[PDB]
Amino acid sequence: AXXXXXXXXXX
Amino acid sequence: KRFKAGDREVQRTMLELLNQLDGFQPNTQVKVIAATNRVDILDPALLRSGRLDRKIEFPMPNEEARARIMQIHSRKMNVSPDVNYEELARCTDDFNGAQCKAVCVEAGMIALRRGATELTHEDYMEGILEVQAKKKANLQYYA
Amino acid sequence: LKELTKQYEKSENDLKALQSVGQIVGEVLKQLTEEKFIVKATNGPRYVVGCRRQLDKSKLKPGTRVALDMTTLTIMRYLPREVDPLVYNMSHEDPGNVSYSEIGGLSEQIRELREVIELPLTNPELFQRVGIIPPKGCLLYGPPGTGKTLLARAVASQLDCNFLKVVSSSIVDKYIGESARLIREMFNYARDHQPCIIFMDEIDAIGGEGTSADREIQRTLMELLNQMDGFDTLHRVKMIMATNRPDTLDPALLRPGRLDRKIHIDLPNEQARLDILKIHAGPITKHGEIDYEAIVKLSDGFNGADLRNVCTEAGMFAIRADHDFVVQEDFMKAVRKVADSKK
Numbered sequence: 001a002x003x004x005x006x007x008x009x010x011x
Numbered sequence: 012k013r014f015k016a017g018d019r020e021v022q023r024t025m026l027e028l029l030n031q032l033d034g035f036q037p038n039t040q041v042k043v044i045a046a047t048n049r050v051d052i053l054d055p056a057l058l059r060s061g062r063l064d065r066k067i068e069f070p071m072p073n074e075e076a077r078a079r080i081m082q083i084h085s086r087k088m089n090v091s092p093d094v095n096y097e098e099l100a101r102c103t104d105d106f107n108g109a110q111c112k113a114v115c116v117e118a119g120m121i122a123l124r125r126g127a128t129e130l131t132h133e134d135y136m137e138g139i140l141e142v143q144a145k146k147k148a149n150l151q152y153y154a
Numbered sequence: 155l156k157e158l159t160k161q162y163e164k165s166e167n168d169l170k171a172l173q174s175v176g177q178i179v180g181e182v183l184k185q186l187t188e189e190k191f192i193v194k195a196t197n198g199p200r201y202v203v204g205c206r207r208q209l210d211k212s213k214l215k216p217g218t219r220v221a222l223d224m225t226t227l228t229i230m231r232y233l234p235r236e237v238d239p240l241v242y243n244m245s246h247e248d249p250g251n252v253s254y255s256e257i258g259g260l261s262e263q264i265r266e267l268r269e270v271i272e273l274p275l276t277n278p279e280l281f282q283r284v285g286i287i288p289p290k291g292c293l294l295y296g297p298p299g300t301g302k303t304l305l306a307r308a309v310a311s312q313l314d315c316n317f318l319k320v321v322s323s324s325i326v327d328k329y330i331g332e333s334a335r336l337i338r339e340m341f342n343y344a345r346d347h348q349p350c351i352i353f354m355d356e357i358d359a360i361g362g363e364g365t366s367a368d369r370e371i372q373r374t375l376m377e378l379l380n381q382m383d384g385f386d387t388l389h390r391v392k393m394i395m396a397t398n399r400p401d402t403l404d405p406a407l408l409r410p411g412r413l414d415r416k417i418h419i420d421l422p423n424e425q426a427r428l429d430i431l432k433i434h435a436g437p438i439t440k441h442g443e444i445d446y447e448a449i450v451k452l453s454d455g456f457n458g459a460d461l462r463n464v465c466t467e468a469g470m471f472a473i474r475a476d477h478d479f480v481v482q483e484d485f486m487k488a489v490r491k492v493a494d495s496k497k
């Protein structure tokens with residue numbers, strides 16, 4: 001359910 | 012919807028469009044229409060008062076609609092005069108109209124492999140199995 | 155020669171204009187001393203700069219935009235705060251001017267909501283005269299479409315105070331802590347723009363248990379509750395959080411200074427149907443007399459939002475027929491269209 005999310009970085 | 016990430020460029024595009032839509036009042040010959048397949052991700056701002064507020068609802072077609080829809084995309088083909096499009100609709104459920112066209116296009120193809128000119132009712136039914144990737148096998152326990 | 159002169163004088167200003175240079179627009183962010191600041195270019199390094207002698211030392215407070223010279227890097231003049239519709243916050247959503255009279259049949263309820271919301275914002279003296287902190291917050295519960303929002307929208311229109319509308323159900327996004335954050339940005343936005351009626355739509359979602367996601371609802375309530383009776387700043391903004399289900403709302407949310415007044419707004423008042431139609435019917439040209447009474451029973455349990463459509467949908471019937479509504483026969487079918495087709 002509750003979902004922790006990572007993230008990238010468009011330069 | 013929204014989200015310094017690299018989406019602060021499309022955000023300017025939306026607010027710009029958001030800006031002009033409210034810029035001009037009704038009574039004008041600039042009637043606007045916008046199409047989206049996922050209206051649960053659109054900004055609430057995009058649909059509040061002076062923006063696309065009267066929202067048009069496009070349903071997944073009903074059974075009678077499907078029988079018609081499967082006709083319009085079959086006119087340009089030499090479909091046999093005995094093809095109970097109605098019966099086809101009954102077998103064609105949970106079908107978006109585009110898929111309702113896929114049967115027609117698939118129906119013509121299935122005839123091709125069989126070396127026929129007019130699409131028989133069976134060809135249409137085989138499309139209704141190959142439009143959804145199903146492969147009809149004569150299972151034995153039926154008889 | 156007279157025509158040549160006025161253009162020639164303008165041209166002379168242009169010759170001076172060619173000479174004039176540009177100033178790198180920037181923002182100040184600290185004041186180390188009486189002659190030093192830390193200014194940042196809009197897309198540029200942070201240069202330590204001084205201020206021109208003919209400038210107000212004071213006016214340049216953190217956040218004060220300036221346009222420093224392009225070579226000296228010394229600020230040469232303040233500027234107004236940049237204004238752009240880059241705002242992500244409904245705050246700019248003008249309520250639009252809606253008079254209280256336009257909402258119909260809620261005289262008592264509108265009267266109450268005036269009290270709690272309007273009073274602390276307009277005549278604070280009354281509250282400070284008696285010594286009670288101004289009441290803050292009204293909880294408007296009622297059947298959907300009855301027009302809870304409009305009353306909350308008219309109150310903004312009379313006070314001429316900015317209105318922020320949050321669809322409360324939307325704020326509860328799936329990823330953890332986003333739901334608390336949207337509420338936090340709302341109240342934080344209010345501190346910047348005062349005074350704003352923070353109208354929360356159906357509040358049952360956030361207020362009113364053992365799962366990771368079953369406590370995210372718990373956290374979001376705690377964030378909402380804190381930002382109200384909360385250390386930081388008590389504030390002067392007001393909230394009109396309106397629900398459809400009042401049993402669900404948690405007890406703390408209904409308290410004196412934490413959202414009081416359970417104003418009930420039931421389906422359009424029996425007499426209102428007239429007033430509502432009165433306020434919503436007359437606009438559309440319609441010379442023919444009206445048997446409104448039959449329309450009233452022809453429209454029992456009508457959501458009121460339906461009533462707005464009733465007249466408008468009738469206008470579409472008129473848009474076909476001819477161009478002038480001259481028959482109640484229209485509202486009858488319009489009443490049906492705004493009933494069976496509104497089911």
Ligand SMILES: Nc1ncnc2c1ncn2[C@@H]1O[C@H](COP(=O)(O)OP(=O)(O)O)[C@@H](O)[C@H]1O
Nearest residue numbers: 257258298299300301302303304430458459462
């Ligand atoms: N009782 C009412 N009086 C006046 N307008 C109403 C009423 N009920 C609905 N409306 C109309 O519907 C809208 C307001 O409905 P809204 O406040 O969103 O309903 P709710 O908040 O109860 O779901 C406006 O367009 C308004 O003109």
